[PDB]
From Swiss-Prot, chain B:
Its main location: cytoplasm. This is Small ribosomal subunit protein eS26. The lineage of its organism: Eukaryota, Metazoa, Chordata, Craniata, Vertebrata. It is linked to Diamond-Blackfan anemia 10: A form of Diamond-Blackfan anemia, a congenital non-regenerative hypoplastic anemia that usually presents early in infancy. Diamond-Blackfan anemia is characterized by a moderate to severe macrocytic anemia, erythroblastopenia, and an increased risk of malignancy. 30 to 40% of Diamond-Blackfan anemia patients present with short stature and congenital anomalies, the most frequent being craniofacial (Pierre-Robin syndrome and cleft palate), thumb and urogenital anomalies. It comes from Homo sapiens. The modification Phosphoserine is found at residue 53. The chain holds residues 2 to 98 of 115 of the full protein. It is found in: Cytoplasm, Cytosol; Cytoplasm; Rough endoplasmic reticulum. GO terms for biological process: cytoplasmic translation; negative regulation of RNA splicing; translation.
Curated annotation (Swiss-Prot), chain E:
This is Small ribosomal subunit protein uS8. The keyword Repressor does not apply. InterPro entries: Ribosomal_uS8, Ribosomal_uS8_CS, Ribosomal_uS8_sf. Pfam families: Ribosomal_S8 (PF00410). Component of the small ribosomal subunit. Part of the small subunit (SSU) processome, first precursor of the small eukaryotic ribosomal subunit. During the assembly of the SSU processome in the nucleolus, many ribosome biogenesis factors, an RNA chaperone and ribosomal proteins associate with the nascent pre-rRNA and work in concert to generate RNA folding, modifications, rearrangements and cleavage as well as targeted degradation of pre-ribosomal RNA by the RNA exosome. Required for proper erythropoiesis. GO terms for molecular function: RNA binding; structural constituent of ribosome. It comes from the Eukaryota.
From Swiss-Prot, chain F:
It comes from the Eukaryota. This is Small ribosomal subunit protein uS5. The modification Phosphothreonine is found at residues 196, 214. The gene is RPS2. The keyword Phosphoprotein applies.
Curated annotation (Swiss-Prot), chain H:
GO terms for biological process: cytoplasmic translation; endonucleolytic cleavage in ITS1 to separate SSU-rRNA from 5.8S rRNA and LSU-rRNA from tricistronic rRNA transcript (SSU-rRNA, 5.8S rRNA, LSU-rRNA); endonucleolytic cleavage to generate mature 3'-end of SSU-rRNA from (SSU-rRNA, 5.8S rRNA, LSU-rRNA); translation. This is Small ribosomal subunit protein eS21. One of its GO terms (cellular component) is small ribosomal subunit. It comes from Homo sapiens. The modification N-acetylmethionine is found at residue 1.
Length: 125, 97, 25, 215, 129, 222, 55, 81
RNA sequence: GAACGAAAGUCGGAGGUUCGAAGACGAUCAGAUACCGUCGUAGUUCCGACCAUAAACGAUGCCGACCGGCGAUGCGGCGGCGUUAUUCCCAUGACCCGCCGGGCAGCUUCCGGGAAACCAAAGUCUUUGGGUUCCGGGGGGAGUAUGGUUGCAAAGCUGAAAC
RNA sequence: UUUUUUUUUUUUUUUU
């Protein structure tokens, strides 16, 4: 029955969303870090929060915790927004894809630079 | 009102289907209404084939099957717990996983 | 009492009432 | 017309992402956006009529002064890279992630918006915004595939929307065409950003390993 | 089977107007049905139309305007004696100056209010508004 | 005397006074949503009636839950009515909640002539009818000096609109004031939705208040 | 928190009792209510990360 | 509607739809006022004017609007020749 | 006005396996003449006559005109120099992708309709008139009494009233 | 496998 309530998890996510720059892997320091940076009106609730946050800490080092992603990963996420390699927008400039798209590219007004040629049977799906 | 659009059976173009005599209660139910299954039951239950695989002359060449057209009616179906209740959108639904 | 067996009792009564009519015509 | 028209460089990119051919099965309202059946069942989407609808959709977004009243949606996660970076270009207020039904209706909600236009991505994967579009009188552009029907869609761009590079190409040439009507860069001049941002990234089975191979 | 073919036509336009379509077909013709649409053309509730000549009995293709809410036929074609049209004015047309009624008078197919200018009257073809 | 609680960008145009009248919203069909909106535009929709309260009874296990169902029908005598239904657990709360929902569904009412073209339009423009439930409430236009010949409840709803004269008809369950008042209300919204032979024109398409005061929306969104 | 009273009322029907309890809210000082905070209600601090990097 | 005294009493003209020619009501909250921008001549630059499209609800539901916009742009003559 | 009309019965004819009304038995219950069990007539079956009822149900009269889609399918017809069986052009088979017609059905849809369930017909309806036949008018008494009429009979058709 | 059954008159709803 370690089935801790919302208001543990409510604070423990706002623990991680404000002051991550003080927390660590350790329980017996964050049990006293929690006092200096929060308002805990109960002494069982001192332990109950602090055991959950340090149990959450071994996931934050490990994987993305969905409720809020930390300030490394936000800008870090942008890092995955602006990764620009400039090679493979396009293949070769003589594409051959379909005999049907030859009737496209001839009859729709172009120069028709790239030839198209495959053939198949018609037993599709 | 209508509990179903089928009204149970699957006589749609016809007027009369032959009844199939049920297996458990032996009440004659027309077969497009009846609950219908087909079991490929093995002739020896699989815990006891390993007895018979090791007590046989052959190199486990003998493996026979027991086919039964096993045929229920809708009263003795739920009474034997095959055809569970569903919900008002779940009556619309088709073949099991 | 079902309308089925209500029709059966009206029938059974009417047949005796019929054989009473034909008796003393 | 006739001066924004397509060139051999445009159709070189379109044919590279594989967005000229669509689904095996169509909306019936997709009659005018098809050129021919093909073996495999795949349908040859004609490309001038995509460009017809890309011609309107750029005219749609620029038509309002204030660009910050454009909300752009993606629920499925091939274009959630695209929407966040498309909005990073022009003026849009991106709603990626989950949609939270009731983003537009209840005035008691906090994260609560009232745009003047909506841009969605996959109309079958986004049924809730298209339903919510009919409540606050707002029009909706959609990047429609063949099997995607057209309830509360206005500007349908025929394409594929199941692919990765297929989707993000449309976002690239839209914003480029949108900025071309804002007056930024010519037709007869090249462009400065390159569409591999907008397209998609997979899990980096390749991306960190291509950076590990380019060590 | 196929009887009262004016009632045939005025369900085709009614089902295409409430569907909201653009142009319709009516697979038989008549000088009844040509002159009835000629009433509707002169008032302008519907657009141009064009009769495809079949050598047997043609068809009519009507470009819809989109005004119509109801185009009906009085089904047995009750005869109309005059000073009984105000009864049909209260009965059929919605307001006091909207809609028309198409009459089969002694000098052709006419209009509701054009009939009492003629002061002749005659049998009904229908109503529209 | 309170501050207006401005929200939703359509209320905020009104406190900029960059919407002239409420007609400038009825063109463009934008959803009116707060009640203080039309209370600004109307010090003439001040007349409302609590039509009927009736209790509804939820059979809960302990006792059956009475909760009251009030009706409020507001009306400008010029032609702006709306009929709201609100059910909450108490008498006073049901009416005050129904005030707001009547202010939500306020609609303009078109009034036309009987058939002479002198002036001062007085009756419904055509034969309309509305259906809500089973009731059909048919309004038939009336001569000048008829009155609103009607059942007592929907006469009162038209008496708050400004119809001088109207013939009525009603078939169905007339014993239920939930339907018979909503089916009356459905028809008098149809007076604009129904066409007319004097509106042939391809229209002009004036600009939206979102469109025209967008620069005024720039300084007021910041 | 919950101050409570019951009183008598003698009316023209018979008698009535009235009960009024009122939950006194917490300010950390005041004759409003008790100075002890609400035990469910756990509030937090603000962040102060506005300035500086290695010089 | 004007009488024989020519009197403007009638409140507003509701936005008649583009394809259906049907009246958009007041409480028909699924209406739309679409606006596609003008472009210039050879320059391909934004004219500061535009053309306004208004569509009604039952067109909007049934998918009919998408045929209606591009054909009205063709009825404008702004999408094809 | 006429013919067809399941099963159940009625009349005579052939035989008569199984099931099996009544019938008799054993249990099981306080009671069982009931379910359950065992034996078993009439019946089931075939041949010539009868009777005309059902949940004879799509509980939706029949003909027609129109108004959304897709996925199939059953029977015909045309086309698709991709296979495969006679011997290989030569025909048809066998699948494969079609388009047409009419058919039993389905999926979805705010076409609208519906009191609602639901309905592509139960839509095109107070914006009411395609043509045409049968019918209901608060529940009970009751398809009962009584008349006629048919049936060998069992019963059918037509059908009240008092209260 | 049962698991059969318990009489009577008695139930008002506006508003600030
Ligand atoms: Mg029922
Ligand atoms: Mg049957
Ligand atoms: Mg009544
Ligand atoms: Mg028989
Ligand atoms: Mg005999
Ligand atoms: Mg004999
Ligand atoms: Mg026996
Ligand atoms: Mg075939
Ligand atoms: Mg008949
Ligand atoms: Mg028992
Ligand atoms: Zn059984």
């Amino acid at each position: 029955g370690r089935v801790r309530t919302k208001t543990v998890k409510k604070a423990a996510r706002v623990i991680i969303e404000k002051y991550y720059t003080r927390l660590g892997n350790d329980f017996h320091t964050n049990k006293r870090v929690c006092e200096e940076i929060a308002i805990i009106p109960s002494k069982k609730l001192r332990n109950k929060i602090a055991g959950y946050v340090t149990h959450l800490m071994k996931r934050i080092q490990r994987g993305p915790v969905r409720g809020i992603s930390i300030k490394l990963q936000e800008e870090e996420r942008e890092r995955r927004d602006n990764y620009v390699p400039e090679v493979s927008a396009l293949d070769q400039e003589i594409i051959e894809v379909d005999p049907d798209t030859k009737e496209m590219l001839k009859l729709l007004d172009f120069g028709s630079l790239s030839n198209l040629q495959v053939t198949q049977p018609t037993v599709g799906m | 009102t209508k509990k179903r659009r089928n009204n149970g059976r699957a006589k749609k173009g016809r007027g009369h289907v032959q009844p199939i005599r049920c297996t458990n209660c032996a009440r004659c139910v027309p077969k497009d209404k009846a609950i219908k299954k087909f079991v490929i039951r093995n002739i020896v239950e699989a815990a006891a084939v390993r007895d018979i695989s090791e007590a046989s002359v052959f190199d486990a060449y003998v493996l026979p099957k027991l086919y039964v057209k096993l045929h229920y009616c809708v009263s003795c179906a739920i009474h034997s717990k095959v055809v569970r209740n569903r919900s008002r959108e779940a009556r619309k639904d088709r073949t099991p996983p | 009492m079902r309308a089925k067996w209500r029709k059966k009792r009206m029938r059974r009564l009417k047949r005796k009432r019929r054989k009473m009519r034909q008796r003393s015509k | 017309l006739d001066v924004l028209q397509m060139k051999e460089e445009d159709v070189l990119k379109f044919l590279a992402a594989g967005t000229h051919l669509g689904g095996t099965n169509l909306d019936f309202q997709m009659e005018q956006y098809i050129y021919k059946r093909k073996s495999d069942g795949i349908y040859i989407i004609n490309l001038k009529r995509t460009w017809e609808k890309l011609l309107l959709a750029a005219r749609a977004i620029v038509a309002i002064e204030n660009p910050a009243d454009v909300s752009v949606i993606s629920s499925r996660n091939t274009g959630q890279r695209a929407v966040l970076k498309f909005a990073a270009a022009t003026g849009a207020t991106p709603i990626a992630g989950r949609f939270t039904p009731g983003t537009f209706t209840n005035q008691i909600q906090a994260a609560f918006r009232e745009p003047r236009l909506l841009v969605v991505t996959d109309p079958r994967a986004d049924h809730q915004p298209l339903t919510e579009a009919s409540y606050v009188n707002l029009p909706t552009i959609a990047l429609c595939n063949t099997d995607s029907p057209l309830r509360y869609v206005d500007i349908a761009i025929p394409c594929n929307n199941k692919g990765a590079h297929s989707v993000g190409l449309m976002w690239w040439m839209l914003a480029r065409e949108v900025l071309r009507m804002r007056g930024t860069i010519s037709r007869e001049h090249p462009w400065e950003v390159m569409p591999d941002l907008y397209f998609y990234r997979d899990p980096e089975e390749i991306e960190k390993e291509e950076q590990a191979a380019a060590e | 089977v196929r009887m009262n073919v004016l009632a045939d036509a005025l369900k085709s336009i009614n089902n295409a107007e409430k569907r909201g379509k653009r142009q319709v077909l009516i697979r038989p013709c008549s000088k009844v049905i040509v002159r009835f649409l000629t009433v509707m053309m002169k008032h302008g509730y519907i657009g141009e139309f064009e009769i495809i000549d079949d050598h047997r009995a043609g068809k009519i293709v009507v470009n819809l305007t989109g005004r119509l809410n109801k185009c009906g036929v009085i089904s047995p074609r009750f005869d109309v004696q005059l000073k009984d049209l105000e009864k049909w004015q209260n009965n059929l047309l919605p307001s006091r100056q909207f809609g028309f009624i198409v009459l089969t008078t002694s000098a052709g197919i006419m209009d509701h209010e054009e009939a009492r200018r003629k002061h002749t009257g005659g049998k009904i073809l229908g109503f529209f508004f | 005397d309170k501050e207006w609680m401005p929200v939703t960008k359509l209320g905020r145009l009104v406190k900029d006074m960059k919407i002239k009248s409420l007609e400038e919203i009825y063109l463009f069909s934008l959803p009116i949503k707060e009640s203080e909106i039309i209370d600004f535009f109307l010090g003439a929709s001040l007349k409302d009636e609590v039509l009927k309260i009736m209790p509804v009874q939820k059979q809960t296990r302990a006792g059956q839950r009475t909760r009251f169902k009030a009706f409020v029908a507001i009306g400008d005598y010029n032609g702006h009515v709306g009929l709201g239904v609100k059910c909450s657990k108490e008498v006073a709360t049901a009416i005050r909640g129904a005030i707001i929902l009547a202010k939500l569904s306020i609609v303009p009412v078109r009034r036309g002539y009987w058939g002479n073209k002198i002036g001062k339009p007085h009756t419904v423009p055509c034969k309309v009818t509305g259906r809500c439930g089973s009731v059909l409430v048919r309004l038939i236009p009336a001569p000048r000096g008829t009155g609103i010949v009607s059942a007592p409840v929907p006469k009162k709803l038209l008496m708050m609109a400004g119809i001088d004269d109207c013939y009525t008809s009603a078939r169905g369950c007339t014993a239920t004031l939930g339907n018979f008042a909503k089916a009356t209300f459905d028809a008098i919204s149809k007076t604009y939705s129904y066409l007319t032979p004097d509106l042939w024109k391809e229209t002009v398409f004036t600009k939206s208040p979102y469109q025209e005061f967008t620069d005024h929306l720039v300084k007021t969104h910041t | 928190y919950v101050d409570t009273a019951v009183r008598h009322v003698l009316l023209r029907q018979g008698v009535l009792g009235i009960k009024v309890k009122i939950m006194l809210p917490w300010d950390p000082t005041g004759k409003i209510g008790p100075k002890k905070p609400l035990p469910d209600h756990v509030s937090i601090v603000e962040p102060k990360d506005e300035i500086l990097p290695t010089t | 509607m004007q009488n024989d005294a020519g009197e403007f009493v009638d409140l507003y003209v509701p936005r008649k739809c583009s394809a259906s020619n049907r009246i958009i009501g007041a409480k028909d909250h699924a209406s739309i006022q679409m606006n596609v921008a003008e472009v210039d001549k050879v320059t391909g630059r934004f004219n500061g004017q535009f053309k306004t499209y208004a569509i009604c609800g039952a067109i909007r539901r049934m998918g009919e609007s998408d045929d209606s916009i591009l054909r009205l742009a063709k009825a404008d003559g702004i999408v094809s020749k």
